[PDB]
Amino acid sequence: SIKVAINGFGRIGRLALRQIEKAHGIEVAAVNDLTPAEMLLHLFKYDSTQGRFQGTAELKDDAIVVNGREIKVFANPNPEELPWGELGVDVVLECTGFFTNKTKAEAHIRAGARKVVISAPGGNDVKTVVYGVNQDILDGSETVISAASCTTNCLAPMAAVLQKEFGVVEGLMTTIHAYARAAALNIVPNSTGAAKAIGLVIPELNGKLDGSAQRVPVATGSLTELVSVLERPATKEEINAAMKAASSESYGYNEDQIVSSDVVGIEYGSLFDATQTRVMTVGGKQLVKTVAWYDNEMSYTCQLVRTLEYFAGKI
Amino acid sequence: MSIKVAINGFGRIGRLALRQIEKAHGIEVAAVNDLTPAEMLLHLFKYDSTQGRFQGTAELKDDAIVVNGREIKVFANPNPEELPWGELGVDVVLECTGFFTNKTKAEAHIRAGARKVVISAPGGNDVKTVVYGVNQDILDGSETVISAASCTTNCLAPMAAVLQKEFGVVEGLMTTIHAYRAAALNIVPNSTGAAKAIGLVIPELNGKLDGSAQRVPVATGSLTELVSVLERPATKEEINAAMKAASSESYGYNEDQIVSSDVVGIEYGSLFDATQTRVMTVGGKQLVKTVAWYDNEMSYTCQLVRTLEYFAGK
Numbered sequence A: 001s002i003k004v005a006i007n008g009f010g011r012i013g014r015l016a017l018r019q020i021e022k023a024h025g026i027e028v029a030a031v032n033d034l035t036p037a038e039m040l041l042h043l044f045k046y047d048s049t050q051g052r053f054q055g056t057a058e059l060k061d062d063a064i065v066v067n068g069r070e071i072k073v074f075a076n077p078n079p080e081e082l083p084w085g086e087l088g089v090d091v092v093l094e095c096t097g098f099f100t101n102k103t104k105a106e107a108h109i110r111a112g113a114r115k116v117v118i119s120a121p122g123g124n125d126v127k128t129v130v131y132g133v134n135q136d137i138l139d140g141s142e143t144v145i146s147a148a149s150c151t152t153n154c155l156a157p158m159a160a161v162l163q164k165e166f167g168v169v170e171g172l173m174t175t176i177h178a179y180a181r182a183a184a185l186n187i188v189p190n191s192t193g194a195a196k197a198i199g200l201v202i203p204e205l206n207g208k209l210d211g212s213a214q215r216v217p218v219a220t221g222s223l224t225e226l227v228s229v230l231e232r233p234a235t236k237e238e239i240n241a242a243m244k245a246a247s248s249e250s251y252g253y254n255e256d257q258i259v260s261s262d263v264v265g266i267e268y269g270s271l272f273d274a275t276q277t278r279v280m281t282v283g284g285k286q287l288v289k290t291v292a293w294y295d296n297e298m299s300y301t302c303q304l305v306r307t308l309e310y311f312a313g314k315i
Numbered sequence B: 001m002s003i004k005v006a007i008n009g010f011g012r013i014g015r016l017a018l019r020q021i022e023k024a025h026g027i028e029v030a031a032v033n034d035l036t037p038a039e040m041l042l043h044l045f046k047y048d049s050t051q052g053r054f055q056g057t058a059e060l061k062d063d064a065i066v067v068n069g070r071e072i073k074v075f076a077n078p079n080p081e082e083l084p085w086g087e088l089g090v091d092v093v094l095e096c097t098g099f100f101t102n103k104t105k106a107e108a109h110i111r112a113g114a115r116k117v118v119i120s121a122p123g124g125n126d127v128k129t130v131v132y133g134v135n136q137d138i139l140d141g142s143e144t145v146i147s148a149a150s151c152t153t154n155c156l157a158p159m160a161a162v163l164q165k166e167f168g169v170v171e172g173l174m175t176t177i178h179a180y181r182a183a184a185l186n187i188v189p190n191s192t193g194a195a196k197a198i199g200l201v202i203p204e205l206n207g208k209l210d211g212s213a214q215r216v217p218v219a220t221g222s223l224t225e226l227v228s229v230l231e232r233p234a235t236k237e238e239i240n241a242a243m244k245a246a247s248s249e250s251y252g253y254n255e256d257q258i259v260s261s262d263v264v265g266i267e268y269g270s271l272f273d274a275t276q277t278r279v280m281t282v283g284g285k286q287l288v289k290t291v292a293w294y295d296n297e298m299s300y301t302c303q304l305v306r307t308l309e310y311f312a313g314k
């Protein structure tokens, strides 16, 4: 049974523990955070947006007991000094935001852990995995991997169906991110690398996509729009049917008229919105728009934990 | 000869239109009509949440609102047929209630004695739709009811006209991010007629554009993105150069890194954002993104008054 440690028991780290508690063959043995256990427990159990933890959780000396099992709590800012080897930790879920490349994340391996999964893009010597699109690139010999970004997890399953079933010539992405000091009150255009980087996840789309982001100062569901030129003719109905045929626990399918609060709490990495699909045909030339939603916290966390569980099965 | 205007619906738009018309010569507002108590209307004329304080004096006399020392008659009748436009010699009504946005409803103003109506919104396809700076030349002065289009159409049209003229447009899809029932705390996808209306304002683009809106629950500047396929190759620099070449009081050009609060209060109908232009080239096939900003209230109102002045001089 695989032992995990969560480094950074923040928004993502806490939700990741909620999801790992649903699984067999894997358990969190320890968490590390700069915040005292007392407050971390309250934030883990009670959440205004993602609801109450569905399980038991209590505080002990230097530990939290979740569903009857002790989880050690540490507060050490330096990962090299954590007792991962002494505790037999197999995999560290790195969720602090401060160790998001290979050389920084390998501090966990110098501390005795065997593997690391970064909760963010990890650089170019680190495999990047969107569960449901490319987890089969993992064979278990990797030491550090990445579960990509929230935008990549939203875009990739949609782009993958378009590429597999129609062929993509090119496309431009616009992501509306529901969240420097400007961003609190303004719509703010922002660079993203997610579309440019999509070849890390879908090699066939390398060099075919670009895009950017509009950061909107409201906390709610986010969305990614893709405007593409395809290699074969398409109807709205045919595109929507292909997306539904691909739907899964990672890729949801929606045909309701929804608003952004309806997305909060989904466990899909991406929720394809079939009501927004449009195909413009002018003189035989076609231009296609497709839109998928994501819950920036929960969608990413559920993908992260799926990727972790799959990786954990390869060792 | 001076033109007399009446404003029907002294709401957000009707009030800002009076603000703008007070700044113009050769034209003046003779009357306003609205159902809201005049006391609440004076306060909102003097104090607007987004556009700030009115730059002048306004007080409530008997049966009138005195603005910069000049009385404007005030009425409250939900039925335009019964308004005294003929008695007052009203040349043009700005129809800004939101409820008379087609030809049959607007022509009540003509029956009441006004010579002409400009609807502050799309007014149906049997009413000429004008975006000033793009197609006001379709007006000959024999029209009785016209439309100054929507805020989104006024933002998109000058951008699309330059693309069509310098490169030719095969097709395009628009996304408008619209600052503002659920739209008060949610992002709400919404249908819009704007990209189709572009096929009226710019007939060569008929049938070639469509799009949609994402309503975002924030009072700030809005923007419109167009993703297009063009008939001729193009670069980011050439597209930006053409937008700057075409700039005017109606169509601004921006090169700085700006955010939506920087757009509040602009008097352009559209502000092209050169920093957001993207041309992607793959195997020789090009896909183009162009973005322009607008203030849903102030951009549109300034276009509405421009159209009103042009129409009234014909």
Ligand SMILES: NC(=O)c1ccc[n+]([C@@H]2O[C@H](COP(=O)([O-])OP(=O)(O)OC[C@H]3O[C@@H](n4cnc5c(N)ncnc54)[C@H](O)[C@@H]3O)[C@@H](O)[C@H]2O)c1
Pocket (backbone or CB within 6 Å): A007, A008, A009, A010, A011, A012, A013, A032, A033, A034, A035, A076, A077, A078, A095, A096, A097, A098, A100, A119, A120, A149, A150, A296, A297, A300
């Ligand atoms: N929408 C999201 O929040 C989101 C989505 C996808 C990915 N991510 C990524 O996940 C990571 C964390 O984001 P988050 O929203 O959970 O941030 P957060 O600020 O809620 O949590 C980060 C936690 O790390 C702790 N911490 C910081 N430095 C530490 C250190 N040296 N040692 C131990 N603990 C440390 C903090 O106390 C905090 O609890 C980042 O990489 C972020 O990009 C976030």
Ligand SMILES: NC(=O)c1ccc[n+]([C@@H]2O[C@H](COP(=O)([O-])OP(=O)(O)OC[C@H]3O[C@@H](n4cnc5c(N)ncnc54)[C@H](O)[C@@H]3O)[C@@H](O)[C@H]2O)c1
Pocket (backbone or CB within 6 Å): B008, B009, B010, B011, B012, B013, B014, B033, B034, B035, B036, B077, B078, B079, B095, B096, B097, B098, B099, B101, B120, B121, B150, B151, B296, B297, B300
């Ligand atoms: N962003 C914007 O607010 C915006 C931008 C462009 C165009 N418009 C259009 O302009 C019109 C007005 O919008 P608004 O934002 O000013 O609306 P508003 O609700 O602020 O103003 C409408 C006014 O009309 C009055 N009114 C309603 N019915 C009336 C009637 N039968 N007789 C007389 N007065 C009546 C109301 O009392 C109110 O004062 C609409 O067609 C709208 O689509 C609005």
